[PDB]
Amino acid sequence: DKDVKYYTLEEIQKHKDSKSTWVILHHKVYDLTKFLEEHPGGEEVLREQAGGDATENFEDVGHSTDARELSKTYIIGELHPDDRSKIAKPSETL
Ligand code: HEM
């Protein structure tokens, strides 16, 4: 039906290059690997954001109510509860 796969910052961060363009959004992990070109906005912005925060960019943009469901298709795992208690807070920002 679906499950997560709680992954840590480091693990996710490794999955940025070549063949696993993962990202953290809101408080959970997405794969956008095949989505790269499909993404009606551009690859490059994703690849820049790859294994970094990209919600902070997405949210300002305010993605469509459709992407909101499709997101749950791209979802890979959740943000491990380890770092969660920290989220050594990017001090801000957007
Ligand atoms: C890594 C985080 C993401 C960033 C930084 C990002 C950024 C962008 C940008 C800059 C655009 C173009 C907006 C414009 O030209 O005005 C866009 C459009 C779009 N994105 Fe993303 N995106 C992200 C993740 C996603 C995901 C996961 C999905 C699918 C759930 C998605 C679905 C879409 C759709 C449907 C559009 C078209 C919006 C429209 O023109 O109506 N994006 N995105």
Query: Exposure pattern of 10-39 as b/e (b: 16+ CB <10 Å)?
Result: eebeebeeeeebbbbbeebbbbbbeeeeee
Classified as helix, coil or strand, 7 is strand
Counting beta carbons within 10 angstroms of the beta carbon of residue 49, is it exposed (0 to 12), middle (13 to 18) or buried (19 or more)? buried
User: Does residue 22 contact residue 31 with C-beta atoms inside 8 Å?
Assistant: yes
Cross-strand bridge partners of residue 1:
none
Do the Cβ atoms of 24 and 10 come closer than 8 Å?
no
Q: Which residues line ligand 1 (CB under 6 A)?
A: 23, 30, 32, 39-41, 45-46, 49, 54, 57-58, 61, 63-64, 67, 70-71, 74
Method: NMR
Q: For residue 52, what are its two tokens? A: 């970094």
Q: How far is the CA of 41 from the centre of ligand 1 (A)?
A: 5
CATH, residue 72 = 3.10.120.10
Overall domain count for the chain: 1
**Domain of residue 2, residue span:** 1-94
Taking the alpha carbons at both ends of the chain, their separation in whole angstroms is 32
